[PDB]
């Protein structure tokens, strides 16, 4: 696990001692007091339970049942009972007529066509209820938590009854983003990007396939006939337009409609009056190598993984300078220390715009990396 420092806790005269620590996923934090067993706090998941479906964008349409009405030039306008149906999309162009095709006089003759709209494959857009976000702490005792329920209590053998006043800070600000779900894959897309899409959408209450003409276009009419240009599945345009977006793994253990993702947690533990212990970490200046090179997450942050074989118990100095050492590289990773030797430690970094230089190391054996960022 991971030990705490001195100022990570405070023991008072009467009452108890409080620990304010931030816990990201799959990173433990231990609480050790002499003549008492060590603690192990593990944040299992930070997930959502059954998000609400806002709309349903169609991206693979099947058009059938094409019917036409033909009116000769200057004899009125053609009408069809399918223009009012919610199943069909209709278009109104004109077909040149004359003595050949049997119409009275020349000119552009009216013609109306309609085609049945049957959406086969459709991606859905979910919106999160920010207060109902689940996050689980497995301190073994199992504890579940909500953004509403920031405090849940549990007594342990050795520390008395403990109350954990917690708080969750998100990572993508669901107040402006959606959760797009394709056939099997999922994504986190912007709300306005999903609403400025040129694809038909089904409403929340069920409604109808509003704005069907984004997928239905007919060939120019001949004398009295139409051919329907079946614009195929624009999945080739969507999965390409969804290349630079953050993914969300569906689920592994819990249930269906239980979407997991990473984030940030802040907790405060209410332990009894105990004389706790502090542990300090030095800096990592030894040889180290990249396990996974710094890659994008989608929301601006770059995530890098490193291995420290020599002098493990330390935090890694990550510097992102404008090269010099002066850095404007705002750091996201908390407790960037190594658990054991030959291990991997995650490092999440938020570089600024333009071109920066990642700096990992001091003096000898510096792991440098460049990362162009043109986020808009």
């Amino acid at each position, epitope marked *: 696990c991971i030990g705490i420092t001195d100022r990570d806790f405070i023991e008072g005269v009467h009452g108890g001692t409080w620990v304010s620590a931030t816990l990201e996923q799959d990173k433990c934090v231990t609480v050790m007091a002499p003549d008492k067993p060590s603690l192990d706090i593990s944040l299992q998941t930070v997930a959502i339970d059954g998000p609400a479906e806002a709309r349903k964008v169609c991206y693979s349409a099947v058009l059938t049942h094409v019917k036409i009405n033909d009116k000769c030039p200057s004899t009125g306008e053609a009408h069809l009972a399918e223009e009012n149906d919610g199943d069909n999309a209709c278009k109104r162009t004109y077909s040149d007529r004359g003595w050949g095709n049997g119409c009275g006089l020349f000119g552009k003759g009216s013609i109306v066509a309609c085609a049945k709209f049957t959406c086969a494959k459709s991606m859905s857009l979910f919106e999160v209820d920010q207060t109902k976000i689940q996050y689980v702490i497995r301190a073994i005792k199992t504890l579940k938590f909500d953004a509403l329920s920031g405090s849940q209590e549990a007594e342990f053998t050795g520390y008395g009854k403990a109350t954990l006043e917690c708080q969750v800070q998100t990572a993508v600000d669901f107040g402006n983003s959606y959760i797009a779900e394709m056939e099997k894959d999922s994504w986190i897309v912007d709300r306005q990007w999903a609403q400025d899409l040129t694809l038909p959408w089904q409403s929340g209450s069920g409604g109808i396939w509003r704005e069907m003409h984004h997928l239905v276009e007919f060939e120019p009419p001949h004398a*009295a006939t139409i051919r329907v240009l079946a614009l195929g599945n624009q999945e080739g345009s969507l999965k390409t337009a969804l290349t630079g977006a953050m993914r969300v793994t569906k689920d592994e253990n819990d249930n269906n409609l239980y979407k997991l993702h990473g984030g940030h947690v802040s907790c405060r533990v209410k332990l009894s009056a105990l004389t706790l212990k502090g542990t300090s970490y030095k800096m990592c200046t030894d040889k180290m190598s990249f396990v996974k090179n710094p890659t994008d997450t989608g929301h601006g942050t770059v995530v890098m993984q490193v291995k420290v074989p020599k002098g493990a118990p330390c935090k890694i100095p990550v510097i992102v300078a404008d090269t010099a050492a002066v850095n404007k590289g705002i750091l996201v990773t908390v407790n960037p220390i190594a658990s054991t030797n030959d291990d991997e430690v995650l490092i999440e970094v938020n570089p600024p715009f333009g071109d920066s230089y990642i700096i990992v190391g001091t003096g000898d054996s510096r792991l440098t990396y460049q990362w162009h960022k043109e986020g808009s």
Partner: antibody
Amino acid sequence: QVQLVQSGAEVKKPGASVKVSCKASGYTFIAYGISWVRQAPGQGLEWMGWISAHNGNTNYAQKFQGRVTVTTDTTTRTAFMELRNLRSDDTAVYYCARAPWEYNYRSSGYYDSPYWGQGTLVTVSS
Amino acid sequence: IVLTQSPGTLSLSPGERATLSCRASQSVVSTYLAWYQQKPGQAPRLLIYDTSTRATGIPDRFSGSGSGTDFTLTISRLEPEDFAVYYCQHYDSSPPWTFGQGTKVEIKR
């Protein structure tokens, strides 16, 4: 309403020719090509040939390829069928039926109700 | 493209439930199957176009269905009028109309 009007009774000796009319009325005849079906007495139905009005290309059954010839008359609003040299089993009742015009899974009326005309009682015997 | 209509001769008393099968070669999005009713001495009266949408004036009890290669014409309550020969026609992306081989529904005793 919408209906197809066919020709009257015809009697021809074997080897002669028969031309059956089918006057469409009530819809846009420029689309909706007219197909032909027959019925031998007792025997079931079988499709002989097919024609269109727009894109006048036609198609015929393989068994009746060398005999039948289907023509159209756009101004007169009529669909024809000429039957060549007549055998004995060719005695039947011949129907003309409304049908789509291109048969390409969506053009115009690929999913529309096919109307049928009256009977054309062709009795061939010496 | 072959068709298979079963059963051939049906013996059902009035009031019972009928079920015909026009087993087609391949059922795809472009598959048209018009059902028919032929009384001896009359032209066929169009029953259902496409696969399940009733024709003009056809009573409510007549209804079609499609599942796999086999299609089904279902009559809920048979009536003395509804005893005749029933047919099915098939055409898909090609001119030719393939017709059924007949299904006569007679009174049982």
